[PDB]
Amino acid sequence: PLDVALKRKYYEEVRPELIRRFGYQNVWEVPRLEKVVINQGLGEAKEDARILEKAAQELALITGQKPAVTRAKKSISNFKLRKGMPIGLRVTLRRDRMWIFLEKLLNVALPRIRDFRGLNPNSFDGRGNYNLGLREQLIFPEITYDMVDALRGMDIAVVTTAETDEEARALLELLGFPFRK
Amino acid sequence: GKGDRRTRRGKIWRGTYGKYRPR
Amino acid sequence: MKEGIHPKLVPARIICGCGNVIETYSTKPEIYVEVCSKCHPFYTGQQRFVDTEGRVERFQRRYGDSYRK
Amino acid sequence: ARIAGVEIPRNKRVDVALTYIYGIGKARAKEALEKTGINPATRVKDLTEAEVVRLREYVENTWKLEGELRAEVAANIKRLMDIGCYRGLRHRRGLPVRGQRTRTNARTRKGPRKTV
Amino acid sequence: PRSLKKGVFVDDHLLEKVLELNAKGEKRLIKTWSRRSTIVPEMVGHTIAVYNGKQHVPVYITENMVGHKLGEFAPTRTYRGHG
RNA sequence: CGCCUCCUAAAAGGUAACGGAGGCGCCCAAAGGUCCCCUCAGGCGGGACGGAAAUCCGCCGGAGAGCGCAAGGGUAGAAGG
RNA sequence: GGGCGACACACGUGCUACAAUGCCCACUACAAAGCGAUGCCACCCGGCAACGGGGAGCUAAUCGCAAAAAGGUGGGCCCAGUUCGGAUUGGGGUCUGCAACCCGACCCCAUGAAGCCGGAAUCGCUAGUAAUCGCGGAUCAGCCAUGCCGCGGUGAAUAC
RNA sequence: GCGGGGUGGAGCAGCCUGGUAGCUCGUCGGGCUCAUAACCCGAAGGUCGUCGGUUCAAAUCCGGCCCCCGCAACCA
Ligand SMILES: [Mg+2]
Ligand SMILES: [Mg+2]
Ligand SMILES: [Mg+2]
Ligand SMILES: [Mg+2]
Ligand SMILES: [Mg+2]
Ligand SMILES: [Mg+2]
Ligand SMILES: [Mg+2]
Ligand SMILES: [Mg+2]
Ligand SMILES: [Mg+2]
Ligand SMILES: [Mg+2]
Ligand SMILES: [Mg+2]
Ligand SMILES: [Mg+2]
Ligand SMILES: [Mg+2]
Ligand SMILES: [Mg+2]
Ligand SMILES: [Mg+2]
Ligand SMILES: [Mg+2]
Ligand SMILES: [Mg+2]
Ligand SMILES: [Mg+2]
Ligand SMILES: [Mg+2]
Ligand SMILES: [Mg+2]
Ligand SMILES: [Mg+2]
Ligand SMILES: [Mg+2]
Ligand SMILES: [Mg+2]
Ligand SMILES: [Mg+2]
Ligand SMILES: [Mg+2]
Ligand SMILES: [Mg+2]
Ligand SMILES: [Mg+2]
Ligand SMILES: [Mg+2]
Ligand SMILES: [Mg+2]
Ligand SMILES: [Mg+2]
Ligand SMILES: [Mg+2]
Ligand SMILES: [Mg+2]
Ligand SMILES: [Mg+2]
Ligand SMILES: [Mg+2]
Ligand SMILES: [Mg+2]
Ligand SMILES: [Mg+2]
Ligand SMILES: [Mg+2]
Ligand SMILES: [Mg+2]
Ligand SMILES: [Mg+2]
Ligand SMILES: [Mg+2]
Ligand SMILES: [Mg+2]
Ligand SMILES: [Mg+2]
Ligand SMILES: [Mg+2]
Ligand SMILES: [Mg+2]
Ligand SMILES: [Mg+2]
Ligand SMILES: [Mg+2]
Ligand SMILES: [Mg+2]
Ligand SMILES: [Mg+2]
Ligand SMILES: [Zn+2]
């Protein structure tokens, strides 16, 4: 399988330093990444122009993986929502494609972000997972100003094998996540 | 323009000078 | 993976404006960025860009000590 | 976005485009194009990726712009409002600040007329 | 503003009261008619009663509010709105 | 005024009153046959626009969800998707 | 010392505009009436600039205010809420004055709002007029003058 | 006891057929007038009597209570 920088860096620098700080007695005890799930709760495409192949074409370029649909679980009056209506996209990244995405995310995306002052320290699950939001998909390198019709950001969920926020915090900072406080 | 101080026509209006109307 | 629904991954060349080049994989073989991890203000320690201000106000006026005592 | 954090209008002369940035006016435009030796007349679409990064690097490094500019000015009023200055109460009651009559006009600070 | 080449204005008589108290250690009350004055670094922590035309308004000065005039802290008008 | 559900009904079945409460006079070409796979409501925590509530991640949750429509019975070891 | 400068609102008189018969920069023309000895201040220098330090002339057809401006030549903008428009505010300075918080003008950096030609209604002007352009004076330390009293430049349409 | 009804300030629509509150007058701000009326131009205000339920959503469909109009209350 693929040799990439972050995947390599995890085993080489992140792994040992982690075993240092928390002193695990088993290799599998030490924090790992399981999956990063990307989401676009969209729903602007509820009725209107429920043609969002433009964003599925977007997310497919960002992650090299075809997103799946999300549809309404229940109908909602105030939101103008028929049950089963197509209102969002979700792609689940594991293994190599997970690293490659995070790799470009940490090295490129967060920098290009408007007035970036560091990731939110407090967006930590409690069970050692992490979630963050994006206002724009232009934040990535593979999406030029030209090929976009409208601003559409996303939800980003990263799951760890950790049990506490503290091991999770360390695993992620050691990988290269920039926290403000 | 005549209300816009940062122009030639503008400072003639006020009857003052500066970088945007030199003497 | 399924075939015919997936954009294809290839070795990629992300270039920054500091002249950082990043070795990775992508759907596009060559990309240029405006900024990166290697040069960003918040990123590089605490390179406080245009303002190492310390305010400066408000004790800072000090013009001067010439009022009398 | 190109410079700085915003993507200045391509198809305009490089000097005008720059003013489409919060924090850079006509003066600061010719001023950035002096200290970089870039032709004030050329269309933005016709910058070298070299000319780009040079023009880029000066502007971003000399002046506070877009986000942080707004941020300080914000904090500047924030404090003025919070010390209880006269200029503070005027911001906190939303009225004008610079010795204008309020009995008429004053609309730009006040907003559309709340008739009675 | 007050022309930078000249001075930073404080009414002579009030400056002295601050400085007298500085020696002794501050602070009593300071009934004043000195709106034309500048708040000045020696004044921090004192409690000054400024005349707004009507009352003597108690203003605790801080390290943040220095370069201003005194009267900016004694409002001349009472306004609660209309209707 | 016919039909269905519950109670009255006295632990088989049945049981009256101008006793107490509600529903039906339809519907579905899939909401049917079968093979294969899947598990809910809700609570806490986390997440751009995003709200009490859209979609996303985690942990707890035997059924309090769902089963077109009244009610009862049944039911996730499916009759639910 | 404060108020006459307030501000949920309504009206009168105005200023500047919404732009290409226009906006902007450079160079370049042609007025008049006035005004001026702790007054106007040529010119030189420091300053992006307001201004500041020098310093000559003039009781003024002599010297100064002084450039008139629309205009002319050239160049840029290219129909866009814009190189239109310049309100609102942030930051920094000059000056007058004992003193510019309430509550002055001006200069500079940044901010760049409303406004795409105006509902019912309604005003002025018959020719060197209307429209448009600049200049001065009184009051006056400075100035909230876009007001007022004058002065010239360009210069119509129409009255059956 | 049977049928109908409650919606800006007044008086009526919309309810049957669930998603969208309308008409005349009146009120308020402007205009014409010396002034008022009329007339002309703009503009506010009903969360639909309540509490409950059905629904994805109720002025609208279903129940409760409240108040109003009409009719009935006969052989005795
Ligand atoms: Mg946390
Ligand atoms: Mg991008
Ligand atoms: Mg975990
Ligand atoms: Mg302009
Ligand atoms: Mg004009
Ligand atoms: Mg700008
Ligand atoms: Mg005022
Ligand atoms: Mg029958
Ligand atoms: Mg029985
Ligand atoms: Mg029984
Ligand atoms: Mg029985
Ligand atoms: Mg039997
Ligand atoms: Mg089927
Ligand atoms: Mg079935
Ligand atoms: Mg089937
Ligand atoms: Mg749940
Ligand atoms: Mg939640
Ligand atoms: Mg939110
Ligand atoms: Mg939510
Ligand atoms: Mg059930
Ligand atoms: Mg008066
Ligand atoms: Mg008006
Ligand atoms: Mg006026
Ligand atoms: Mg007017
Ligand atoms: Mg605009
Ligand atoms: Mg003042
Ligand atoms: Mg402009
Ligand atoms: Mg507009
Ligand atoms: Mg236009
Ligand atoms: Mg016009
Ligand atoms: Mg007109
Ligand atoms: Mg008419
Ligand atoms: Mg006549
Ligand atoms: Mg005079
Ligand atoms: Mg004067
Ligand atoms: Mg004023
Ligand atoms: Mg004048
Ligand atoms: Mg009514
Ligand atoms: Mg009907
Ligand atoms: Mg209907
Ligand atoms: Mg009226
Ligand atoms: Mg009338
Ligand atoms: Mg429901
Ligand atoms: Mg409704
Ligand atoms: Mg209801
Ligand atoms: Mg309801
Ligand atoms: Mg009812
Ligand atoms: Mg009767
Ligand atoms: Zn870089």
Distances (CA, A) of D33 to A13, D1, D8, D21: 45, 20, 15, 15
Per-residue DSSP letter, D7? B
* D interface test, pick of A145, A146, A147, A148 with most D CB neighbours within 10 Å: A145
* Chain D hits for C34, Cβ within 8 Å: 1-3, 56
Cis peptide before D4 (omega within 30 of 0): yes
Helix H, strand E, coil C: the string for chain A is: CCCCHHHHHHHHHHHHHHHHHHCCCCHHHCCCEEEEEEEECCCCCCCCCCCCHHHHHHHHHHHCCCCEEEECCCCECCCCECCCCEEEEEEEEEHHHHHHHHHHHHHHHHHHCCCCCCECCCCECCCCCEEEEECCCCCCCCCCCCCCCCCCCEEEEEEECCCCHHHHHHHHHHHCCCECC
The end-to-end CA distance of chain B, in Å, is 20
Report how far residue A57's alpha carbon sits from residue A49's, in angstroms, rounded to the nearest whole number.
Answer: 15
Beta strands in chain D (DSSP E): none
The class of domain E1-83 in CATH terms is: alpha beta
Which nucleotides of chain H have an atom under 7 angstroms from any protein CB?
19, 28-29, 43, 56-57
Residues with CB under 5 A from ligand 49 (ion): C 16, 18, 20, 36, 38-39
The answer to whether the CB of C39 falls within 8 A of the CB of D56 is no
Report how far residue C47's alpha carbon sits from residue A50's, in angstroms, rounded to the nearest whole number.
Answer: 45
Report how far residue A170's alpha carbon sits from residue A16's, in angstroms, rounded to the nearest whole number.
Answer: 12
- The answer for C62, left when phi > 0, alpha when psi is -120 to 50, beta otherwise, is left
Per-residue DSSP letter, D101? -
Question: What is the per-residue burial (b if ≥16 Cβ within 10 Å, else e) of E53-69?
Answer: eeeebebebeeebbbbb
Which nucleotides of chain G have an atom under 7 angstroms from any protein CB?
1-3, 5-12, 15-17, 23-26, 48-51, 66-67, 69, 76-78, 82-97, 99-114, 133-136, 144, 146
Distance from CA of C16 to the nearest CA of D (A): 10
| Closest nucleotide to D75: CA versus each C1' | G90
Element containing residue D74 per DSSP (H, E): helix D66-83
Cis peptide before E6 (omega within 30 of 0): no
- Helix D49-62 / helix D26-34 crossing angle, nearest 10 deg: 120
* Length in residues, chain E: 83
Query: What phi and psi values does residue D36 have, to the nearest 5 degrees?
Result: -125, -10
The CA–C1' separation of C15 and G150, in angstroms, is 72
Query: What phi and psi values does residue B21 have, to the nearest 5 degrees?
Result: -155, 100
* D interface test, pick of A115, A137, A147 with most D CB neighbours within 10 Å: A115
Contact partners, residue C53, CB within 8 Å, separation at least 6: none
Q: Which long-range contacts (CB under 8 A, 24 or more apart) does D76-80 make?
A: D79/E64
A124, A129, A118: which is closest to A158 by C-alpha? A129
Q: Rounded to a whole number, what is the largest CA-CA distance in chain E?
A: 52
Chain C: touching chains (3 or more CB pairs < 8 Å)? A, D, E
The answer to whether the CB of E51 falls within 8 A of the CB of E35 is yes
Q: In angstroms, what is the resolution?
A: 2.8
The CA–C1' separation of A71 and F77, in angstroms, is 30
Tokens 């403000």 locate to: A180
Select from C17, C34, C49 the Cβ nearest to the Cβ of D61. C49
Contact partners, residue C38, CB within 8 Å, separation at least 6: C16, C18, C20, C44
The answer to whether the CB of A111 falls within 8 A of the CB of C40 is yes
Cis peptide before D14 (omega within 30 of 0): no
Select from C5, C6, C37 the Cβ nearest to the Cβ of A107. C37
Q: Rounded to a whole number, what is the largest CA-CA distance in chain B?
A: 20
The CA–C1' separation of A119 and G111, in angstroms, is 30
Report how far residue A14's alpha carbon sits from residue A102's, in angstroms, rounded to the nearest whole number.
Answer: 15
The end-to-end CA distance of chain A, in Å, is 37
* Chain E hits for D116, Cβ within 8 Å: 83
Distances (CA, A) of A55 to A68, A135, C67, D21, E60: 11, 14, 67, 29, 58
Query: What phi and psi values does residue D114 have, to the nearest 5 degrees?
Result: -100, 75
| Beta strands at A33-40 and C10-15: parallel, antiparallel or unpaired | unpaired
Contact partners, residue A73, CB within 8 Å, separation at least 6: A83
D63, D71, D40, D49: which is closest to D2 by C-alpha? D49
The answer to whether the CB of D33 falls within 8 A of the CB of D14 is yes
Helix H, strand E, coil C: the string for A47-77 is: CCCCCCHHHHHHHHHHHCCCCEEEECCCCEC
Residue type, D97: V
Per-residue DSSP letter, D104? S
Report how far residue C59's alpha carbon sits from residue A149's, in angstroms, rounded to the nearest whole number.
Answer: 51
Report how far residue C19's alpha carbon sits from residue C32's, in angstroms, rounded to the nearest whole number.
Answer: 10
CA of E37 to the centre of ligand 36 (A): 23
Token reading at A146: 């030209």
3-state SS, residue C10: strand
| Beta strands at A154-160 and A33-40: parallel, antiparallel or unpaired | antiparallel
Question: What is the per-residue burial (b if ≥16 Cβ within 10 Å, else e) of C20-30?
Answer: eebebbbbeee
Count CB-CB contacts under 10 A for residue B17: 11
Token reading at D63: 């002046």
Question: What is the per-residue burial (b if ≥16 Cβ within 10 Å, else e) of E4-28?
Answer: eeeebebeeebbebbeeeeeeebee
Distances (CA, A) of A95 to A2, A69, A153, A160, C26: 10, 22, 24, 13, 15
DSSP string, C11-60: EEEEE-SSS-EEEEEESSSEEE-S--TTT-TTTSTT--TT-------SGG
E7 touches chain C (CB under 8 A): yes
Method by which this entry was solved? X-ray
Select from D83, D86, D116 the Cβ nearest to the Cβ of E75. D86
Report how far residue C33's alpha carbon sits from residue A23's, in angstroms, rounded to the nearest whole number.
Answer: 40
Q: Please classify residue A1 by burial: count the beta carbons closer than 10 Å to its beta carbon, then call 0-12 exposed, 13-18 middle and 19+ buried.
A: exposed
| Closest nucleotide to A129: CA versus each C1' | F58
Select from C2, C9, C36 the Cβ nearest to the Cβ of A108. C36
Sequence spans of domains, chain E: 1-83
Which nucleotides of chain F have an atom under 7 angstroms from any protein CB?
41, 45-59
Report how far residue D54's alpha carbon sits from residue D78's, in angstroms, rounded to the nearest whole number.
Answer: 35
Q: What is the CA radius of gyration of chain D?
A: 20
Q: Across the strands, what pairs with A158?
A: A36, A130
Report how far residue E54's alpha carbon sits from residue A120's, in angstroms, rounded to the nearest whole number.
Answer: 51
Report how far residue D5's alpha carbon sits from residue A111's, in angstroms, rounded to the nearest whole number.
Answer: 10
Cis peptide before A118 (omega within 30 of 0): no
Q: Measured on CA atoms in the order A10, A16, A18, A23, is the torsion positive or negative?
A: positive
